[PDB]
């Protein structure tokens, strides 16, 4: 299928960090720091909503600027259910669309049908049922919804633990009981059974929302994530290159405390 | 698959009437009247529950007596979730097991995993979501839950209309909206989409529970059922052979009022 | 249209009394007493429900017996929503079908589509909205739901007053306000506007349920009904011929107190 | 009828964009950009209500100025239920009256009787029942109520999906069930049945309220609208001519992502 | 009676506009513009209450100034239940007292006994029952309570429609039912029956509260009012003479759209 191609595409991000960037300068710092992809963002949606505005797809022009500035994959956000925003993003020729709850919802009841696109989608989830629903709709990659722009990892920890815990429950579960389990999750039975066989999520699972420090990033990796997303927080500080490198280093060496000491020492 | 074989098996019952019988005499009357199958029943579960007892699988001996007495397929009831009752019934070599809510529930949370058997199962449903869940569990044939032993068709009409109505809703529905629809039904998405393509249920759909008269049986057929189940009510009356024939005739000639007049004239 | 033909058919009953009969003897007494039609009834539905049973269409045989016994029109009851019962009744060749809430409901959500039949239907109503809904479905004649087999006129008076009162409200109403009025009635606007122009119901309106005495029958006529239905109560008394005649006489001479004295004097 | 003439009048706007304008300068920009009509507006009602004022019909003088400045049809708003505002607008000789919930309600219980006018009316709706009610009152054209002056498309998407979804439900629905369906919609049965036969709304259906970007406009068209309304937002920006052209282009080429990229590139 | 004399006095205002004036200059503009009476007002009660003060009878001196300045009748407000304020107003020799809910209530439970005065009273009402109660107390003229100093006609429309609608209901109503109707209105039966015979209110019925534009004034007249009250809004604008004349012209020519266009064109 093209689906498995998209899934495979997403797997090459495993082990990596993805950074929110608002311009080409930041994008290069990200790339040099060793980010595996960048997320293009006209403005931080936190700030647009804090001022009571609607947060939409970013201007294609500014996305084009970032796509040119770097050789690593570029991602951008479409509003949930806004399949035309996604068509535009596909046509600009970015690598991944993030169907993002951080932007203003466009459809209260329906997500984008992501199978109708040739490029892979990221979606958020709070639990396994939601993850499996996004995947069936054609998401090639899952992140935690976490908590947008607070710096608080508590929500991301809840989500990772929730998802991973249900997968562990599912792995050992009497097969006869999986029907009821699928009902309670309101998830497609066929994806539930596949998740059972795999013993993990059929797609790459990243942590997102709240990851603020190297320690946070490493925690996410130790809890069994495949990678992390980081916000614009990195670039709103001193030596952005250093803070960027630190989080990449944390994710690469997530089980080496000595390394984590080094990258955290003197960050502010 | 063996699944499609079981589904195909069940199609031979299309256009037919299935009658509850409590002995071999009744079974022969049923067969001669033109019933397409019989349902073997130690005792009427209505009466066992009315006297506050538990209603279980029938004695294999009495089932064996009925299997011998007739050449039409024989069905018997297993309690919901009682997979060992089903194993016994399979080994006796009956034709269809009815996983029946009319018997005392054995498992509050789980139905039998019907895929683990080589003979086909009937299950009940009140709506499409329930039907699709029973099918995914491996039911080869669906009936309405209706209302056991009241003679009141109202519940069966509700169920037929409910199921058929949702199928019609599903047939025309924007494909992008079917994901959410599957969530709301708590039904496997893949079976929902298949039902959409077929424009009907993937399995034979019978009416059951409350069908008392020729008019009732014909109504069910006109509402789009593939056949009907009838209770032991038939044999608690004056000329059981006549009443039996009448319901068969009603189902065969369900769109011929003239015929329905004839079979109803002078029944009591 | 055939609709207007059915409406016209029903208008021939204007000024008349319709009597429930359970056999041919009673039917002839009814006819000779001057009833404009008879309602065939295997058994009184009151008694079938009082014993917790289901009340359905009557046996066509006993209906045939009554159709033969008399030259006045014969009516019979179909369960609400039971369109096959109605097909049978049509094919027997009776004159009017009563879609009757006195029988056990067959469809909780839908009435018979009465346009699909060539013979006229009676329906019950409690108010104008309900009346207009039954008419749009193709009822040619409206009766009050009243109160089955209590002998208590209070419900019938409520219904007549309700319907007539809303018609009077409608007759004078600002045309610009009729849209909202139709919304509140949940009735088809086109039938509402027609009722406004006519200043009465587009169909014959009879009183039913609770009419026990000559005084009751005359009251209904004075309140603006076109005729009345009477139950089997008549025949559960002395000189049924006398009691029958009395109600007919009451309806014919409903504004002549002297007559009403005469027919009521010495009845019980 | 004059009704079908008004419906036909409105159909000429199919495929088009209608823009809110507050003066003649803006009106010409709209016309040159390729708008199919303009909506004349003294002031943005959002601002009048935000300052706690009453929003009424616009001054006829300023409407006259805009009618002269352009050759495309002119629309103006009357308060709901304010039939005299509508008479004035008709007499000024504008092309379409919008009975608009964006203005201060004049009649809590009744809309204008739009049949009493010779020029066509637009009304808003949230669902099919409301649409069919406005049409029966004589609206020649339906728009979504959406959400006035937020730039948030979510309400408009809900409304389109709602209306279109119920039409799809209605298209396939058992005819016998349409009576109850009309009751639940509180909509005229005759218009419900007509909508069933047509398989779409008897009138042009436009999207309105929240449409902010080319992507939004195209989404509405992809969801099956016949055209869109846009607010004064367009003219509160740089090169208003460019932003205006962009939305027109988006609606014309709503299924061409490449086009949508071009018109969205560099908009701000 | 003196009552019918007062009623007749009030009828000579039929067809007219009454304007709130706060000085003699405004009073003359009103008179020249063709107002049929003026309402003397020390200060706008809206402003006295907006500043948390009590709004009472106006200073007799300022009322005397207005009575001298014009030859048209002068009205003034007394607080509800404040019969001594009314005695003072009578003694000053004004023409009409308005027992006004716009002023601070003086008696929570009782209105002025208006029969004890030789000059006619105006009272407000929201519905027919309230109107009939005020009349029995001796009001010679009824206005809607509407909504003081908002410019919003919605409340006045509600009241007119309410009153007129109940009168229409009453006109056609079965006489036998009028007793209960009077109970539900908590209105004197004798005035209810009189209103029934007349087919309208026994006294002049004016619209008041919210009438802001010519269109508003004409709407009130088209809904069946006998005249309108207008607030000080007129004089808080440009060319007060023009705006004054416009509303008078609107009420005189309330069914001529062309006229309404002319008087509304260029008002602001």
Author numbering:
A (entry chain A), B (entry chain D), C (entry chain C), D (entry chain B), E (entry chain A): 22 to 289
What do the authors say?
Crystals for preparing seeds were produced by combining (1:1) ∼12 mg ml−1 Pdx1 with mother liquor (600 mM sodium citrate, 100 mM HEPES pH 7) as 10 µl vapour diffusion drops in 24-well XRL plates (Molecular Dimensions). Crystals for seed stocks grew overnight and varied in size from 10 to 50 µm in length. Vortexing with a Hampton Seed Bead was carried out for a total of 180 s by alternating between 30 s of vortexing and 30 s on ice followed by storage at −20°C. Batch crystallization involved a 1:1:1 mixture of 12 mg ml−1 Pdx1, seed (105–107 ml−1) and mother liquor. A popular strategy is to fragment crystals to make seeds to control crystal growth. Seeds effectively bypass nucleation, acting as nuclei to instantly initiate growth such that protein is shared throughout crystal growth. Lysozyme and Pdx1 crystals were concentrated by settling and applied to sheet-on-sheet (SOS) chips. Serial synchrotron crystallography (SSX) data for lysozyme and Pdx1 crystals grown in batch and within microfluidic droplets were collected on the new ID29 beamline at the European Synchrotron Radiation Facility (ESRF, France) using a 2 × 4 µm (V × H) beam of 11.56 keV X-rays, with a 90 µs pulse and 231.25 Hz repetition rate, and a 20 µm step movement between images. A JUNGFRAU 4M detector with a sample-to-detector distance of 175 mm (1.8 Å in the corner) was used to collect diffraction patterns.
Using Arabidopsis thaliana Pdx1, an enzyme involved in vitamin B6 biosynthesis, and lysozyme, we demonstrate crystal scaling to suitable dimensions and numbers for time-resolved serial crystallography. Here, we report the use of droplet miniaturization for the controlled production of uniform crystals, providing an avenue for controlled substrate addition and synchronous reaction initiation. The approach was evaluated using two enzymatic systems, yielding 3 µm crystals of lysozyme and 2 µm crystals of Pdx1, an Arabidopsis enzyme involved in vitamin B6 biosynthesis. The method was demonstrated with lysozyme and Pdx1, with crystals grown in droplets producing equivalent (if not better) diffraction data quality to those produced under batch conditions.
